[PDB]
Amino acid sequence: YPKNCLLTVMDRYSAVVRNMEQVVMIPSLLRDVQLSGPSVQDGAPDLYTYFTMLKSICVEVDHGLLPDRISEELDLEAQFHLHFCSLHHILTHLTRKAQEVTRKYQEMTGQV
Amino acid sequence: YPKNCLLTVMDRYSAVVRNMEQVVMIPSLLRDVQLSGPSVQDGAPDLYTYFTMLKSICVEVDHGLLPDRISEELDLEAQFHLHFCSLHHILTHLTRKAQEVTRKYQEMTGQV
Structure with missing residues (x-):
C-alpha cells in the first residue's frame, strides 16, 4: 500500500489523533483557546470544540466508516x-x- | 472490522469485480448489450462500457485510493x-x- 493513498492516510490520521489523546491530559485547558489564532465572542466554538471534532472523526475512521471562515473548518465533520x-x-x-454483469455473461454464453 | 463498514465494502467490491474478470472471458461479447435492460441508439454507452467502468473503479479501490437516467449510472466513476x-x-x-493541537497543548503546559 502506497504512502499517498487514502487508506495509508486513514491510519496516519488515526495514529496522530491517538497520540493527541495521550498528550492532551487535561482537555479542559483547551476551553477558551481561540480557533482564529489568538470578532470571536464568548460561547462560540473554540479549540476544545475542535479537538472534540477531531476525536469524533477519528472514531469513524477507526470503525472502518459505518453509516472568519473557520466556520468551514467545523463543517468538515459533516x-x-x-x-x-x-x-x-x-x-x-x-x-x-x-454481480449482475457476471450473471448476464454466464447467461449469454449458456453457462446457466 | 464490522460487515457494514466502508473498508469491508471495499474489498467485497474488489472480490466481486475480480471474480467478474475471471468469468468474463470474452469481453467483446458485452459490446452492443444495452444498459437499459434490452431510446438508445448505436454508438452510445453499453454493457461493455459499464464493465470497463467497474474495472476502472476497482483499480482505484485496489490502490488504496491514490489521487433515460442511466446517464447517472456512468457519472458514478466521476x-x-x-x-x-x-x-x-x-x-x-x-x-x-x-498535530498543531498536540503542539499547542505541549506549549501551553510548558513541555517545550
Whole structure:
C-alpha cells in the first residue's frame, strides 16, 4: 500500500489523533483557546470544540466508516460524513451491479 | 472490522469485480448489450462500457485510493472520484491540524 493513498492516510490520521489523546491530559485547558489564532465572542466554538471534532472523526475512521471562515473548518465533520457515506453507497450499488454483469455473461454464453 | 463498514465494502467490491474478470472471458461479447435492460441508439454507452467502468473503479479501490437516467449510472466513476479525493484531502488537512493541537497543548503546559 502506497504512502499517498487514502487508506495509508486513514491510519496516519488515526495514529496522530491517538497520540493527541495521550498528550492532551487535561482537555479542559483547551476551553477558551481561540480557533482564529489568538470578532470571536464568548460561547462560540473554540479549540476544545475542535479537538472534540477531531476525536469524533477519528472514531469513524477507526470503525472502518459505518453509516472568519473557520466556520468551514467545523463543517468538515459533516462534509467528511457526506463523502464517506456516498462512497459506501456507490461501492454497495456497484457491487450488486458487477454481480449482475457476471450473471448476464454466464447467461449469454449458456453457462446457466 | 464490522460487515457494514466502508473498508469491508471495499474489498467485497474488489472480490466481486475480480471474480467478474475471471468469468468474463470474452469481453467483446458485452459490446452492443444495452444498459437499459434490452431510446438508445448505436454508438452510445453499453454493457461493455459499464464493465470497463467497474474495472476502472476497482483499480482505484485496489490502490488504496491514490489521487433515460442511466446517464447517472456512468457519472458514478466521476462522483466516486470526487468523494474519495475529498476524503483524502480532509484527513490530510486534519492530520496536520491534530498535530498543531498536540503542539499547542505541549506549549501551553510548558513541555517545550
